[PDB]
Amino acid sequence: HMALEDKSSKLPDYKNDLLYERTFDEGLCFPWHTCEDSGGKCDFAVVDVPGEPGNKAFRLTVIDKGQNKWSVQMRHRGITLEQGHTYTVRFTIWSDKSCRVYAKIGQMGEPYTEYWNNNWNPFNLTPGQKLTVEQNFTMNYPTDDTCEFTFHLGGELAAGTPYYVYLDDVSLYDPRFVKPVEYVLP
Amino acid sequence: HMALEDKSSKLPDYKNDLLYERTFDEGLCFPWHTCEDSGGKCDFAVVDVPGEPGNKAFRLTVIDKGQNKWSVQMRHRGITLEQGHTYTVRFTIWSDKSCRVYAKIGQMGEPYTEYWNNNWNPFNLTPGQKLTVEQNFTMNYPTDDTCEFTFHLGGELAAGTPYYVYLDDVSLYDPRFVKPVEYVLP
Ligand SMILES: [Ca+2]
Numbered sequence: 001h002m003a004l005e006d007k008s009s010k011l012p013d014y015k016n017d018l019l020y021e022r023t024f025d026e027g028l029c030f031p032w033h034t035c036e037d038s039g040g041k042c043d044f045a046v047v048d049v050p051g052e053p054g055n056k057a058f059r060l061t062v063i064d065k066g067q068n069k070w071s072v073q074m075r076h077r078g079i080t081l082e083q084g085h086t087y088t089v090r091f092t093i094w095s096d097k098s099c100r101v102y103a104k105i106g107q108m109g110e111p112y113t114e115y116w117n118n119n120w121n122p123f124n125l126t127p128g129q130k131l132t133v134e135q136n137f138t139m140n141y142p143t144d145d146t147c148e149f150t151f152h153l154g155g156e157l158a159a160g161t162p163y164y165v166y167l168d169d170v171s172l173y174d175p176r177f178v179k180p181v182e183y184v185l186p
Numbered sequence: 187h188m189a190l191e192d193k194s195s196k197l198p199d200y201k202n203d204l205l206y207e208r209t210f211d212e213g214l215c216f217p218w219h220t221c222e223d224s225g226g227k228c229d230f231a232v233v234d235v236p237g238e239p240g241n242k243a244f245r246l247t248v249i250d251k252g253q254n255k256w257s258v259q260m261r262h263r264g265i266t267l268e269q270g271h272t273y274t275v276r277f278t279i280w281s282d283k284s285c286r287v288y289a290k291i292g293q294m295g296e297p298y299t300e301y302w303n304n305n306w307n308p309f310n311l312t313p314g315q316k317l318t319v320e321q322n323f324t325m326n327y328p329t330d331d332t333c334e335f336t337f338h339l340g341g342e343l344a345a346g347t348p349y350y351v352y353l354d355d356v357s358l359y360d361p362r363f364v365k366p367v368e369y370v371l372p
Pocket residue numbers: 023024025055056057168169
């Protein structure tokens with residue numbers, strides 16, 4: 001189905017982004033979705049950012065933290081990391097409670113090799129503090145088309161349930177990547 | 187419909203082409219279609235080009251010449267010629283009989299202004315002879331979004347019916363034109 005380019009002034013060119021939705025400002029989040037596993041429970045909506053007309057954010061409700069950090073996630077699959085390419089990972093996240101969020105890009109399936117993960121450190125969210133992250137890394141492993149960009153929220157990362165975690169302005173940029181185009185008329 | 191880019195080593199860049207189908211090599215022709223008018227009858231199909239593995243071409247069967255040159259046509263609509271732009275018209279045409287083909291890019295409706303038309307001359311097709319045309323013209327009239335690239339085959343142009351006219355490698359290139367792109371997700 002048909003995806004939506006954005007022309008955000010604070011992100012790199014959409015055409016070189018491996019992600020298909022970055023700003024949620026149309027109320028749409030696809031291909032971003034949630035996962036429940038091992039007892040986790042969650043919901044999602046795209047919602048207005050208070051004080052910032054026009055601006056909307058992806059909002060995950062953590063309902064049950066389940067049995068593991070990976071019991072609750074928000075993710076974007078369909079990611080190939082290319083040997084030799086240098087990626088810029090970018091995102092704004094916040095929460096209405098004190099919680100942790102483990103961000104990673106890595107294999108969807110076993111053995112779940114992690115290609116990026118903020119050097120094994122989750123991010124500490126604090127109410128009233130938004131975190132805008134920007135990091136680079138270079139894929140030194142063989143090219144891997146089975147990757148996802150995922151945030152784990154469950155288990156010992158979780159605050160008291162239920163609560164909200166927000167994502168916005170999310171980008172995985174590669175200067176040597178261009179999305180496949182299709183042409184339409186019109 | 188979604189359109190399929192080609193990367194012909196003989197045509198200019200697909201993204202700069204006002205035409206959505208140029209090589210026919212997949213078995214598909216859309217938006218190239220036929221028209222029958224004032225007595226004309228015809229058919230079409232995409233068929234293999236004998237002796238040239240993997241090459242296909244649009245084939246028009248002229249069934250009945252009708253009353254006018256315009257009674258039988260093969261044509262691509264959805265063409266905006268823009269004032270001051272310079273357009274390269276390209277095409278390869280041939281037939282199993284001696285006939286004439288009138289090629290033009292002009293208005294779809296009354297008054298049928300013709301912006302390019304090989305200086306009012308139809309092309310003379312002879313069996314065993316393929317014609318590859320390449321001409322430039324600049325659009326000196328005001329931009330007109332009601333144009334088509336049409337080939338007339340009826341009336342006094344026509345050979346003894348039925349017979350086939352073939353079209354291949356068609357392109358209408360403008361260096362200052364870029365097709366709009368949609369993004370689709372693999
Ligand atoms: Ca937003």
